[PDB]
Amino acid sequence: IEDGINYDPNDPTRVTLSLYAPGKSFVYVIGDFTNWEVDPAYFMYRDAPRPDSVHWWITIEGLTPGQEYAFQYFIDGELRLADLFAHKVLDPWHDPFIPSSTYPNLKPYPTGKTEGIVAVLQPGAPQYQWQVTDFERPPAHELVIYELLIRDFVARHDYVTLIDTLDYLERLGVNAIELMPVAEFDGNISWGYNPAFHLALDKYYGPADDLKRFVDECHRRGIAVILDVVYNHATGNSPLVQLYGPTADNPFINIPARHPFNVFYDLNHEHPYIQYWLDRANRYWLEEFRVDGFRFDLSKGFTQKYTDDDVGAWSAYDASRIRLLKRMADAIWAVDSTAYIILEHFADNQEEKELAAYGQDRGRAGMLLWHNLNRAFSQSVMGYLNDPNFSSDLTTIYYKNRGFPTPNLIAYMESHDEQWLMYRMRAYGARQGAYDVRSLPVALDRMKLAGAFFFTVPGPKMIWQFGELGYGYGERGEQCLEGTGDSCPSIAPGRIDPKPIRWDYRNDPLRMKLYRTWAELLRLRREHAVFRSPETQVRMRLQHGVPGRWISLTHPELSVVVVGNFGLEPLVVTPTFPQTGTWYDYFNGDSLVVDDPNTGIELLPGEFRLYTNRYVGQAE
Ligand SMILES: [Ca+2]
Ligand SMILES: [Mn+2]
C-alpha cells in the first residue's frame, strides 16, 4: 500500500485509499459510493508508526468493476480534498466546457453533492493493450526533439487528432516528440505551467487511453515521447497547498519563494514528503504511459537556497540543488536506467557540467540541459551580424566550444518561450538593395541556411512546432510572442494565449521547401554518424559579425563542409576543407575539386552548401 488509490490485481470490486496527513484529527472518505454523505463505515484508520509518518487509510469493498467513482477526503469536518495522487479529477468550474468530442461520455461533476475538485477511482479499469514491445529509444545525445503544444498544434487539441499528424512528424526526421505539460493544470486553456494534479492527465487533451495509443504509435515509428513536467510549484488547487493551507505554516511550500521566477506556490524540495511525491510522479508517468523521459520545467527552482530576486545568485553553483536533482535522477534511473532527464536549467557552467556528467562513469547518460541559441540565431537570420547589443556568434552550438566534454546540451533556435525567428525576420530583418530579409521567400531561404548550421552539428537538438513551415509574423504580425523584448503589434495574442493554427502552410510550396530542406538534413543525419557522434572533430568559422560562415566535420565514416552566406550581398566564403580531393554538393548534385584546403565558394546572400568528401547521394 502506497498513498493514493490502490487497486487489488486479483479483485476488481475493491480499493484501498491512503492519505499522508500529520496533524489532523479525523478523516472520512466521501464519494459516489457514500452518496456524498458521511458514513461511519468510511471513517479512516490512522496509521502513525512515528508522529512524522501519519497516514489515514481505508479499504472499500463492494464496488462495481469498470465503474468510475468520484471521491474526496473529508478532513477534520471542514476540508474536502481530492487525492494528491489522483490520476483523473473532475473539475466543477471547467469540465462543463470540455466538448463531448474532446472527452467522450465524460462523467459529470456531482453538482450540489460536494464542492471543489473531486478525484476519480475506477476498479476493474480496462487495460490498454500495448502493441510495441521492442522499441529502442534513441541515444540521449542523439535526440532531435519536436516541442509540441497540444492546444495549438491541432484545432481539436487532443490525442486522437495528434495520431493523424504522425506521418508529417516522422517525415520531418525528428526522433522524439516533447509534449508541453499534459498533467492536470488549472482550467482548460493553458501552456500547462499551472499544475494542480501532477499525476492526473488533463482532460482537455482527451482520454488517457488515447495518449497511450499515441505513445504506442510513436514507438511503432521509432519516435520517443518526452513529457514536459512542472514540479517547481503547484497552484492553490493542488492538495499540497490545500492540505495545510496557502501560508508559511504549510511545510510543503515556501512563502516567500526561495528564488526568482517563481509562480504559484514554490515547493520545498528538501521536504521528505515532496521527494516521495516527486519520485511517485516520475515513476507513474514512466510506468503508466511508457514515456521515454521528462523535461523538467524550471529545474533551477529545485532548491531551498534563498536568492530572493537575484538571478545571478540563483544561477550560481548550488550544491544543495545539485544534490536534489541527482537524488531525483537516481530514483528515475532505478525505475528505468535509460529514461531521458532533460533540465530547463540555465545555471552556471560548473553546475551544468556536473549534472551533464552525472552517472556517466557508472551506467547513465547524464542529464541533458537546454541550450538557448534563440538570440544568436535571431541575429544571424535577420542579417544583423555586428549588432551593438546582441551576439550573432554561433560557435557554442558545438558542446566543446562551451567547454563541455560530452554532447549533453540540447541546442535550439526556437522554443515555446522564445520569439519565432520568422517574426523577427519579417518585422525587423535587414535589407540591401533588392535583397530584403523581411520578404517571406527570402526569410524562408534564411531558415534553410539556419538549419544547415544547426541540424548538422553533433549533440541533441530541439525545434518548436511549425518553425519548419516558417511560422511567425503571419499575415500582419499576429504570430508574435509577447514578453521577449520585441514590441508585438496590438493584434498579437497575449504571451500564453492561443496562437493561430495554420496547417494551410502545407499548401504553400515555398514553405514546403523549407520543411523538405530540414527533412533532408535530418535524413542525412540519421544515417551518417559524422553529424551525431562525440568522435566527430569540429572546426568552424561562426564568429560574431562574420557573414561568410562555415563548419567542418571529420569522422571515420565521412567528412563534411557546410558553407553559408549570412550577409546581405554576394560573397566568396573560404572554408578550410579538411582534405583535398573531390567534394560533393549534396543538394545540387555536382562536385568541386579542392586542390587547396582553402578554396573559395561564391554564394548569394542567404545561400548554403553542404559538401561531403565521398558521394552519399543527392537531396530528394
Ligand atoms: Ca485542467
Ligand atoms: Mn522552487
Taking phi over 0 as left and psi of -120 to 50 as alpha, with beta for the rest, 290 belongs to left
Taken in order of first residue, the domains within the chain and their CATH numbers are: 4-121 (2.60.40.10), 143-189+216-228+272-531 (3.20.20.80), 537-612 (2.60.40.1180)
256 upstream amide cis, omega within 30 of 0: yes
- Order of strands across the sheet that contains 233-234: 233-234, 265-267, 253-254
Resolution in A: 1.5
Instruction: Find the 341 Cα to ligand 2 centroid distance in Å.
Output: 18
Instruction: Find the 504 Cα to ligand 1 centroid distance in Å.
Output: 29
Instruction: Find the 286 Cα to ligand 2 centroid distance in Å.
Output: 23
φ and ψ of 440, to 5 deg: -55, -50
Q: How far apart are the first and last CA of the chain?
A: 57
Q: 269-281 as b/e, with b when 16 or more CB fall inside 10 Å?
A: bbbebbbebbbbb
- By CB atoms closer than 10 A (0-12, 13-18, 19+), residue 109 is buried
Cell of 48: 502513525
In single-letter form, the type of residue at position 95 comes to D
Cell of 243: 492540505
- By CB atoms closer than 10 A (0-12, 13-18, 19+), residue 489 is exposed
Of 388, 577, 371, nearest to 460 (Cα)? 371
DSSP designation for 103: S
Long-range contacts of 107-116 (CB under 8 A, 24+ apart): 107/68, 107/70, 109/70, 110/32, 110/36, 110/70, 113/35, 113/36, 114/30, 114/36, 114/72, 114/80, 115/80, 116/72, 116/80, 116/81, 116/82, 116/92
Cell of 605: 546572400
In angstroms, the CA 387 to CA 476 distance is 25
Instruction: Find the 316 Cα to ligand 2 centroid distance in Å.
Output: 15
Neighbours of 412 (CB within 10 A): 23
Q: Which H or E run includes 278?
A: helix 272-289
| Whether the Cβ atoms of residue 616 and residue 584 lie closer than 8 Å to each other | yes
Q: Which H or E run includes 559?
A: strand 559-565
| Whether the Cβ atoms of residue 542 and residue 393 lie closer than 8 Å to each other | yes
| Whether the Cβ atoms of residue 63 and residue 125 lie closer than 8 Å to each other | no
Whose grid coordinates read 531521458? 340
φ and ψ of 321, to 5 deg: -60, -45
Widest pairwise Cα distance in the chain: 91
Distances (CA, A) of 547 to 3, 564, 606: 60, 8, 10
Give me the residues paired with residue 89 across strands. Answer: 119
Cα 356–Cα 362–Cα 367 angle in degrees, nearest 5 = 20
Instruction: Find the 186 Cα to ligand 1 centroid distance in Å.
Output: 5
- Ligand with smallest separation from the Cα of 265: 2
In angstroms, the CA 360 to CA 356 distance is 8
- Ligand with smallest separation from the Cα of 205: 1
Give me the residues paired with residue 43 across strands. Answer: 28
Cα 170–Cα 172–Cα 175 angle in degrees, nearest 5 = 55
| Whether the Cβ atoms of residue 181 and residue 228 lie closer than 8 Å to each other | yes
In angstroms, the CA 228 to CA 183 distance is 9
Which segments of 389-479 does DSSP mark as H helices, in order? 421-428, 440-452
Instruction: Find the 88 Cα to ligand 1 centroid distance in Å.
Output: 10
Instruction: Find the 183 Cα to ligand 2 centroid distance in Å.
Output: 18
Q: What is the CA radius of gyration of the chain?
A: 26
Instruction: Find the 318 Cα to ligand 1 centroid distance in Å.
Output: 34
Instruction: Find the 251 Cα to ligand 2 centroid distance in Å.
Output: 13
- Ligand with smallest separation from the Cα of 307: 2
Experimentally, the structure was elucidated by X-ray
Distances (CA, A) of 122 to 207, 239, 443: 14, 20, 53
- Ligand with smallest separation from the Cα of 183: 1
Kindly give, in sequence order, each residue whose CB lies less than 8 Å from that of residue 347, ignoring residues fewer than 6 positions away: 300, 315, 316, 317, 318, 321, 355
- Ligand with smallest separation from the Cα of 195: 1
Instruction: Find the 323 Cα to ligand 2 centroid distance in Å.
Output: 14
Instruction: Find the 256 Cα to ligand 2 centroid distance in Å.
Output: 10
Instruction: Find the 203 Cα to ligand 1 centroid distance in Å.
Output: 7
| Whether the Cβ atoms of residue 68 and residue 107 lie closer than 8 Å to each other | yes
In angstroms, the CA 139 to CA 118 distance is 40
Residues in the chain: 620
In angstroms, the CA 618 to CA 350 distance is 42
Whose grid coordinates read 477534520? 76
Cell of 169: 512528424
In single-letter form, the type of residue at position 325 comes to L
Give me the residues paired with residue 369 across strands. Answer: 343, 409
| Whether the Cβ atoms of residue 532 and residue 142 lie closer than 8 Å to each other | yes
Instruction: Find the 447 Cα to ligand 2 centroid distance in Å.
Output: 36
Of 148, 135, 300, 295, nearest to 211 (Cα)? 148
Of 337, 495, 370, 513, nearest to 420 (Cα)? 495
Strand boundaries in 207-264, DSSP class E? 224-229, 233-234, 253-254
